[PDB]
Design a protein around this ligand. Structure first.
Ligand SMILES: [Cl-]
Ligand SMILES: [Zn+2]
Ligand SMILES: [Zn+2]
Lengths: 366, 349
């Protein structure tokens, strides 16, 4: 019944010959520069672990640490602070260059090695019997920034990663301030890289990225800015100018940001969260806002292939980009379902409905 | 019927996964359920014992001299270990066929450790490495046994596939129109039917094993089902491989049950009559089938283990062999425990 559809029915589905294989629940928020909710899928206020999609907020805490400007981090270094990188040789080399700028050593890092986020990098490592170390962490740039901040304020590099350290107090405050939340409305766990990681309502992740893009618009327009808005504009610019540092060759985030050529930034979180900050455009005005836009997505069950398909679908439904810009992402939008003998066996479909119908149809967030 | 397995990071919900499960008696009557026990479901590799039955019921196949380990490989989603490829080649030699006759293709191994070994050695898998290679050699054997020709043995209009289609519907106790068909990753037809009927197939496998052990008069079909059960339970390493759930589950239970994975996170178990089954309120064998709605395999194995604990199947000591699958490791890159898995579902009876 098309006239009784509900947020509880917002799915992405895979089929085999038209027979349902898997279904995945989708949650999404689309917000304006003040965080007002414009569009939604599923539960746009779902309490959600932002994971690596929080990294621009952690980069802001680093860049707002007094004395950090003195180390001479450049835009590619800031983009690495914002990264879940593929551990390509260029990412490891930049991590070592950043450690040299702060006179620190790989032994000061409190992140650990893991298999690469890139299948091709991981194949190179397997071929050479290479065991990844701390410097190879997808979060290595964030950790070097946290060490830089610790040294800058004279707090000591020992325990920079623990909640009692002032660098983590700064991160905690900065995340809550960008979300416009009380500290008690942000929950904290521990991440794969061994830092504190926040959880907050999904719409507030959209709000962070709307603030990033709004700051970029203010900077480009030559508006007078707070130190905080200038730092946010710098983070947006660094991610957009160096998208290969944010992820790497063949990665969604890098391909998305190269396709859009400065119009937006986007970032993956582990367990299938995504956030995008969109600069004011004809598309944002058509959506009914006079400023920048933020988008956040979660796939309930954590599937990354589905996340990238949904994010690309939602950009198409919001009219963000042109068909020609979005076509660079076609392999992610409609993932290949081809068997071991080259036969197409199925596909992906998007039985979800954006909401902004009878007044009597309740839209219960689910 | 809103039944989930949930993962957390420091008590904060990370992912949640919808669970469907059916527990059935030997006639397919529903005893217990999670979610929607009649969900239309692609059985994928969990249909393999029904396809093995079609092969074993083909006139002339007994002549090739397949042994129990060969039948276990017909029932397998194997890890493509060197021992699986060697048994595939031995089975091809028993039917005087060659790897070129197979119409399945190579894929990355279902074992990360095997796959890493292949990457290290620049090895490109071929048809003989397919997880389905044993099923394909059996389908070639059945085609050659009835003189149907090996060309197109995998196509729906080949008599081997008409035999498979009918045999699946018969074991489900469904009309042909109630079973849907797609194409699998190995390029064979693959069925979909209500989840409880996957449990019914496995209840029939275990019931057949009980009837055989008891010296009951059996149809050729019940004798063949008993043989398939015995082959899987005797050679569980052929069904999957080192470290795989299916192999560890069947070794732990030492003949008391068989279990099999389907791709995209289905699972089926056939349980021989026991003190546990009698306590659950049935006088015969039982079948269990599970689907994780979103396809997550780590969650499937956690749920299946949890369900065996809820049903009292095995002893605590037997089920402790599966502890790493029951409560999967949530340890970060620096050895710190960050989270875990919870089962906020309730079996309904
Ligand atoms: Cl590149
Ligand atoms: Zn991290
Ligand atoms: Zn197969």
């Amino acid at each position: 019944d098309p006239f009784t559809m509900t947020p509880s029915e917002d799915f992405v589905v895979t089929d085999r010959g038209g027979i349902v294989e898997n279904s995945h629940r989708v949650h999404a928020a689309v917000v304006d520069a003040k965080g007002r909710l414009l569009y939604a899928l599923g539960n746009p206020t779902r309490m959600t672990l932002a994971r690596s999609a929080a990294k621009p907020a952690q980069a802001l805490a680093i860049l707002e640490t007094e004395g950090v400007a003195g180390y001479g981090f450049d835009d590619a270094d800031i983009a690495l602070m914002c990264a879940s990188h593929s551990s390509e040789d260029r990412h490891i080399a930049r991590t070592r260059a950043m450690l040299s700028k702060i006179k620190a050593e790989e032994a000061d890092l409190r992140c650990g090695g893991h298999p690469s986020l890139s299948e091709m990098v991981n194949r190179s490592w397997i071929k050479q019997d290479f065991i990844p170390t701390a410097v190879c962490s997808n979060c290595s740039g964030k950790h070097v920034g946290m060490l830089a901040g610790a040294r800058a304020i004279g707090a000591g590099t020992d325990g920079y990663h623990l909640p009692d350290h002032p660098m983590q107090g700064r991160v905690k405050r900065t995340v809550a301030e960008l979300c416009d939340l009380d500290a008690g409305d942000v929950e904290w766990g521990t991440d794969g890289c061994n830092l504190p990681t926040p959880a907050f309502p999904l719409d507030r992740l959209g709000r962070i990225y709307a603030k990033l893009a709004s700051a970029a618009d203010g900077s480009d327009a030559g508006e007078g800015q707070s130190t905080r808005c200038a730092a946010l504009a710098h983070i947006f610019r660094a991610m957009a100018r160096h998208p290969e540092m944010v992820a790497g060759e063949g990665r969604y985030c890098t391909m998305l940001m190269r396709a859009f050529d400065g119009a937006l930034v986007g970032k993956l979180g582990a367990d299938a969260s995504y956030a995008i900050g969109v600069r004011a455009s004809d598309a944002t005005r058509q959506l009914g806002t006079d400023g920048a836009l933020g988008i956040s997505v979660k796939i309930e069950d954590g599937n990354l292939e589905m996340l990238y398909a949904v994010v690309t679908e939602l950009l198409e439904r919001l009219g963000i980009g042109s068909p020609d810009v979005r076509s660079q992402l076609a392999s992610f939008h409609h993932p290949q379902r081809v068997n071991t003998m080259g036969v197409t066996t199925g596909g992906v479909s998007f039985p979800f409905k954006l909401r902004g119908d009878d007044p009597r149809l309740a839209a219960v967030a689910r």
